[PDB]
């Protein structure tokens, strides 16, 4: 407005900042748009804001560029120290960003005060433009996880059916042994060897099923299912690629979170996936 | 020679461009080399060129260094913050690049460099991927024939065991169903043989020392001899896909469609 | 009167120093802040101090930069190729640091900065280590309580099962070893109960659906409710040890002995 | 000697190089040592060699120290001039694949007026990195062998109780044979006692199913965790030397990725023996 500014956070890597300053190409005072990359030296910013301002007339007559500066708040856990003209912008943004303070001293031109304060984006503000894409990719891997749960439901359909048939056959055997045993039409001593023979036969069949473990293609991955939900369903390369692209951003948000002394909790954004 | 240069890609991550400049004290042409990182600003390259050119004169009186301006594609000027990945991107579709230095030129006011492309840029990558994919393929097929070997040995030994136990079924059936010796004279044979195969199924635990060792574990024991482990293996496949997503990025953004079988068709030829 | 100065460690990786200089046309005293990464060479800092100071006229010809000289501790000049981390290391033992610009404005030509200590630097590490130690401690004891809780239910269910099966020992001892019904009238009770035991497993396998689920798996299912997973857990412990090896590095190089319980003695007081 | 130099690789991060040129009154030519960090700019290097040379008496005023310039080979799968403020390490890598580069002084006392310095090789860079890697790798292989022998101690502690179980089950086989075949007593009294024994060993084989008490893994057991640590050698040093050992292989494979020369540690398996 008058002595206030803001340095915004674009979704790209760049910044922008809007500062009011007098220019006679405009009428009185315009808030101007300046863009910044965080690997540019601070001399480029002072030359860039030095270029869109009508100059200070030299009282010696001959030397008319303006001489601008930058001053921050040295924190002692007041005091102010000026920053050299060849730091990168990003490191200064981080230091004054925890300081929550920024001024500019344009020499000569300011009629009164000559202290343009600007305001940095707080940790939540900086994070927001990361958290949107983080929440998006977490949402769609949650959906593909739900479809994996659906083919799990297919798997236990097959298991339940196979096991139901086995229980029916075991009930058949229990009734035929009881009927041919308690009725006293055949005694026990002709039912005992048939029991041992059947026990050998089911130890043979268990010796068949103990051979059956053909493929176990894991990584958490099955073998019956791997052809099932891929050659008719939804992919797995894209699943691991969204894992890979998803794991990177959380470290950046936690690094910037380390820079701001603010506890990053993703369970405090569990509440934002619902309303 | 005169107003023409070129930009080249290192085997590392960086770039290098070659521009015909005029240095502090030379003749009019010298193909000076400048090493740039691609995700980096553009004012950095402006500063790095303007370090090596004689400055502009008064100006009443100014000894200030020249001002370059990277117009590209008619003469759409580009700002001092767009990164070199994007400027080589849109210029790479344009196949043109103009650095118009001022003061220094004495009216020529132009420089043209030729942007490398996707076949050329990736060809460098393809070599990296072509070599590592061949190294995947050989170890793959050797691992497969080891799988066939351990599978065959396991099923032949299990087939022998089913042979002897089926023999036990046959002699119990014919001994107690012929009714020469009774089942009462057959009970000891069954239970005492059952402890005898707890014996013969228990000696193997201590001398030859299985301590699971199922069908799969014989193979996993086996290609400790015949091959290499799984960590190097998945590093090769996973890093191969890490290269493939990047050639999909660059060839996607350059908008020329590509599949990597088209140099497997040049691996043997 | 302003030959003083100090260097302060940022909470980030790269740290800054504060020196009194004269930039273009000012009064002689002004602090100027300069950001330094400790993997940069010394000559880089030499260049950044050369940027903001007026040049020196030396009689055909005027060197546009001055020349500074990072002597230290009895004075030993240090060459302009050492690491800044090493120069802060040996100077940190010395607790002194001297920059000496050749040009002297008016009888003042020296500058002392005061190299800080492992106390301040490693409380920019100790705040992190104390916070992660508190988090690990609380989550640890909650998981242990959860761990204790699972085994109570496991031993109750197992003790009940041993109760009824011991009853099955007593009833088959007493029914046929000493009493009226003989073993011939007892055998189908044993075998038919054995298939009836089996029926129980099938019912258990299908309605309440255990598809191992042993004693450890009740715990591992249980603190999915009461706690957090193991990957985050071992990430906190492993990164905590990564910080501990670095404070052992810095206190190993600055040579003041240290154990980290000595601030747990201030975590409650 | 006169037109050949070499830039070596010190055990530290920062290079050195030795080039012959003319100096103050002491000698005609001396291969002099220049110390270089790979992050200093190239103007620093030219100035460094511009400083230890007597200047040229240059008219039209006094601009006396020379202006030196670096030249390398632009591989075409010629000679270009590298700019005066690249960083040294990137120039080292690019001309390192070119295997030569050329310094030119302005004095030109020699007729050739060139200095073809030599380039450090893959065997030398990875020579020092390989000495570090093999030293720590041996230094964990010994502790791997001590893990092997305490594992053998656990093997002995198992084989005792397994031998006792085999002896007891042989005792049971013989007592069932004597009280069965002799016919002093008929099978119809050994049958009941067999079923009762089968219940009792299902109980004793049921209380062992609770005995899976601690399993502290990461590949790690729990029966031995007090034994090899609170009487033997640590595990913190084990995982720490793992952590310090995993980093260097990526650097050797990055520098190996630059030189287009294959990196095989099994071709260095042969160097741990002779
Ligand atoms: Ca019987």
From Swiss-Prot, chains B, C:
Mitochondrial intermembrane compartment spans: 177-185
Topological category with respect to the lipid bilayer: Multi-pass membrane protein
UniProt: Ca(2+) binding residues: 187
Gene Ontology biological process: calcium import into the mitochondrion; mitochondrial calcium ion homeostasis; protein homotetramerization
One of the record's GO cellular component terms: uniplex complex
Top-level division of the source organism's lineage: Eukaryota
Mitochondrial matrix side: 207-269
Record localization: Mitochondrion inner membrane
Residue ranges crossing the lipid bilayer per the database entry: 155-176, 186-206
Oligomer and partners: Homotetramer, assembles in a dimer or dimers configuration with two interfaces.
Function: Highly selective calcium channel localized to the inner mitochondrial membrane, which mediates calcium uptake into the mitochondrial matrix. Mitochondrial calcium homeostasis plays key roles in cellular physiology and regulates ATP production, cytoplasmic calcium signals and activation of cell death pathways. Sufficient to operate as a pore-forming channel without the need of calcium-sensor or auxiliary subunit.
Entry's family note: Belongs to the MCU (TC 1.A.77) family.
Protein's name in the database: Calcium uniporter protein, mitochondrial
Species the sequence originates in: Neosartorya fischeri (strain ATCC 1020 / DSM 3700 / CBS 544.65 / FGSC A1164 / JCM 1740 / NRRL 181 / WB 181) (Aspergillus fischerianus)
Gene it is expressed from: mcu
């Amino acid at each position: 407005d008058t002595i206030a500014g803001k340095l915004l956070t674009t979704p790209s890597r760049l910044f922008k900042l809007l500062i009011p300053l007098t220019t006679i190409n405009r009428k009185d005072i315009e808030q101007i748009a300046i863009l910044i990359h965080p690997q540019q030296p601070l001399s480029h910013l002072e030359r860039l804001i030095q270029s869109e301002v009508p100059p200070i007339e030299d009282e010696n007559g001959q030397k008319r560029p303006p001489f601008v500066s930058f001053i921050a708040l040295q924190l002692e856990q007041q005091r102010f120290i000026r920053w050299s003209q060849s730091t990168e912008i990003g490191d200064f943004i981080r230091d004054a960003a925890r300081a929550k303070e920024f001024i500019v001293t344009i020499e000569g031109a300011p009629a009164g005060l000559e202290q343009i304060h600007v305001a940095v984006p707080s940790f939540d503000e900086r994070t927001y433009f990361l958290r949107m894409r983080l929440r998006k990719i977490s949402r769609r891997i949650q959906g593909l996880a739900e479809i994996k749960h659906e083919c799990d439901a297919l798997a236990h359909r097959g298991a339940q059916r196979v096991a139901l048939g086995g229980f029916g056959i075991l009930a058949f055997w229990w009734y035929i042994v009881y009927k041919l045993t308690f009725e006293t039409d055949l005694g026990w001593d002709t039912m005992e060897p048939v029991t041992y023979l059947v026990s050998l036969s089911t130890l043979m069949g268990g010796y068949l099923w103990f051979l059956y473990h053909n493929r176990e293609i894991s990584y958490t991955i099955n073998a019956r299912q791997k052809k099932l939900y891929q050659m008719k369903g939804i992919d797995l390369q894209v699943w691991e690629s969204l894992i890979d692209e998803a794991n990177a951003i959380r470290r950046e948000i936690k690094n910037i979170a380390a820079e701001y002394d603010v506890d990053w909790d993703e369970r405090k954004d569990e509440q934002d996936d619902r309303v």
